[PDB]
Each structure stands twice: as structure tokens, then as C-alpha cells.
Amino acid sequence: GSAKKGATLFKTRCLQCHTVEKGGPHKVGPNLHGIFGRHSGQAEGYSYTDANIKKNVLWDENNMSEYLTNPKKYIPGTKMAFGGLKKEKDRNDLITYLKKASE
Amino acid sequence: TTPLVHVASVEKGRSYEDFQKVYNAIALKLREDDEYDNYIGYGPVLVRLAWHISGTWDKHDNTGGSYGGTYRFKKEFNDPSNAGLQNGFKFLEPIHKEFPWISSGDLFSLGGVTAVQEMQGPKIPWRCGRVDTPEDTTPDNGRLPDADKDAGYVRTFFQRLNMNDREVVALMGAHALGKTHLKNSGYEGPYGAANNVFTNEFYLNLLNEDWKLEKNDANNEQWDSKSGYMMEPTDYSLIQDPKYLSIVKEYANDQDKFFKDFSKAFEKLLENGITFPKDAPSPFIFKTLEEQGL
Ligand code: HEM
């Protein structure tokens, strides 16, 4: 997907809760740096609900589309108050941007 | 020789699925036009639209309300406190031309009910029967709350809408949606981090993080926190009055109770000043787009 517009989708839909630069300050959501390759519930100094650790699934770009389409449905009991990326293109735009700032 | 009484007449030849299609037409465009106002969606303005039209009611003489649907007149269209509500009206313009039978009151109220449900909020029972009215019934300006007041103004204003302390604190929890616009109202900044999803964060943010009354660039006082959130003078007075404070704690703790109480108060709000005959059907409970598999 597009790497330039995926940054815009992050700034408007994800920046208020998450940070991507290494050592980024935890907000309402976790710092999503280097999240690809590691599983779910990666505390590193953060408090998660047991629901996301309960679904110990490795974060590859395929299942995160399954997650960002409906966070409640993919993880019953999650804390992320997010509407969801209803368009597959917006999912491919946003995920490609994370594939750079979260390496 | 008598105060006005607004009888609900259901549109001829309409039932449940006839209005369920209208919900789906509204909820569908909330999916497509998801770019409005930096990817907030039309949800927040759609419920403020339903609020500002239903908030014009006056229980003393039963004027205004959602019944007449007189927002389509320029007299209510040019309200400074209704600045920015044109976008919620243009969102419903193509919907009303597709269904030329529905009344403006039923359409406006259905828009707010749709957005609350679609934004993961509580299911709000809805009723039909609102009827259009001429122009002489368009209420005058200044029938909506001023944002630059204290808790005494909040309690005395909502009594005009016949709502107790508990019912008014629940309605304020809808401010967790959307944001304030400078060129619209005179305040800037969002209320919370989940400005597109109906959540409990409103009461949480009030007590979680502190606030320091600062200046904005439009010469208005706003309570701003370090995390970027902001509130209004009338909104901040909720944690100054102890009786309103005893209710923000139960809302910030038992979220299910807040969803349960908001749907009661939001229905009563949209049904003010409307007397339904008993031959009218039971309140509808429309199904969200996820419940239909979309
Ligand atoms: C927006 C585009 C967005 C993305 C992308 C995103 C991703 C994301 C992931 C992959 C996780 C799981 C991390 C893990 O280690 O398991 C996660 C977790 C949380 N986030 Fe998030 N998230 C996006 C949006 C938002 C928004 C808008 C908020 C808050 C307003 C938010 C916050 C959270 C929270 C809370 C969690 C914890 C989930 C849990 O504990 O179950 N995110 N996010």
C-alpha cells in the first residue's frame, strides 16, 4: 500500500494513543515500536488487560488487518477504543507505514 | 385558547423494516464519508444535530422540540450556537431525497440514534410519528445552553427540558465524542482520545487528569490538560457541584450503568413534547451493521 498516506492515517487515527519512535512515551495505548515479530500483550512497562495476552498471536501484517478491521471481534475484551479500518486499502496504507517506523 | 399538544402520526404505510432501511442508509454513509474532519466521521455532529434540535423544547408551553423538525428553516439554520450543524444537515440531504416520505423530525432524531449505536454505544429505542409544521412554529434563537457558565446554569437550564441531575450528567457523557471548533463555537480541542467511539472516557478524563483554566486564541476560557484534552466552563462545573460529582464517579466506575442511563435519557430527550397514542407501535430497536454481518 501507499507509504505516504499511511502516515496521515496514523496521525489522525492512532497518534492520540500510540507512539512509534523507539522509546516513545506510553499514552492511553502502548508504544508500537518494533511490534512486528513479537506477539500480543508485550508489556515492556505497560498495563494490558488479560484479553490481548489471552490471544497470544504473533503480529504479522496479515492478522493485524484482521485486528484493525474490528478490535472487539478479534480480541474479546480489548481496551483499545477504536472504530476500525473498514476499507482494505486504508488497512494496506496504514500497515505499510508501521512497517517502517516500527522495525 | 390552549397550549400546543403535538400528536404523533406515523407515516402512512410504514413499519419496522421501512425505518430499518433508513437506519442502514444513514449508517452506511457513516462508513463511506469517514474522512470528514480528519477522520472523525459524521457521527459526532449527527448526535449534536439531534441534540440541538431536540434541545429547543420548553416544557412550560410545549414549544420547540424534535416533533416539528423546523431546523430546515433559515430562522433556525442561522443560529450562532448551531454553527457547524450544516454538515450534519447536508449528510442527511441525500438520505431524505431517497425516502421522500419520512418527516424531518423523524429523520433528524434517527440520525443521532444511528450514530450512537454505530459508534459502539448503547442501543437507544426509537419511535416514529413526528410531523412537519409550518414556519410560524420555528423557535427563536438562544434556546440552547451557553458554554461559558457554571453548574447553577446547567441545573436550571435542563429543568426546562424536565430532566433531573442523574439524567443530565448522563447526557454530558456524549461530549466525549468529536471536538470543539474555533470558527464554530469559540473553543478548540477534543474532549478525549476516542473521539469517534462512544466510551466512558468523558467522566474518566474529568477525574483522571487535572485541568488548568487557560486562554485559547479566541479569548475564551477553557480547561486544558497536559495530555491534550480540553473541556468547557459548563462541562467542568460537573466536578465542582457535589451532587453532580456523586454521579460522575459511578459513571467513571460502572460503565454499563452509564450506557444504561444514557439510552433512557437520550430517548426521553428525543421524545420530549410528543404525545403518542396507544395505537402507536412499541419502540423500535434497530440492529447495527455488525449485527447484519457488514
Ligand atoms: C490505529 C490506526 C491503531 C492501530 C494500528 C493500533 C494498534 C494496536 C495494536 C497492534 C495493539 C496490540 C499491542 C499488543 O502488544 O498486543 C494495540 C493495543 C492497544 N491500543 Fe491501539 N491501535 C490503534 C488505535 C488506538 C487508539 C485510537 C487507541 C486509544 C484511544 C489505542 C489504544 C490501545 C490500547 C488501550 C491497547 C491495549 C489493548 C488491550 O490491552 O487489549 N489504539 N493497538
Ligand code: HEM
Ligand atoms: C450544557 C450542555 C452543553 C453545552 C453547553 C454544549 C455545547 C457544545 C459545543 C460548544 C460544542 C462544540 C461544537 C463545535 O465546535 O463544532 C459541542 C459539541 C458536541 N456536543 Fe454538546 N453541549 C452540551 C451538551 C451536550 C449534550 C446533551 C449532548 C448529547 C446528548 C452533546 C453532544 C455533543 C457532541 C457529540 C459534540 C461533538 C460534535 C462535533 O464534534 O462535531 N453535548 N457541544
